[PDB]
Design brief:
By secondary structure, the chain is mainly alpha-helical. The protein is built from one helix and no strands.
Length: about 15
């Protein structure tokens, strides 16, 4: 899960 969180996180802006 740690890896999952870390790799996803920088893409949270993609619709904003």
């Amino acid at each position: 899960f740690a890896a999952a969180x870390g790799l996803x996180a920088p893409q949270x802006p993609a619709p904003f």
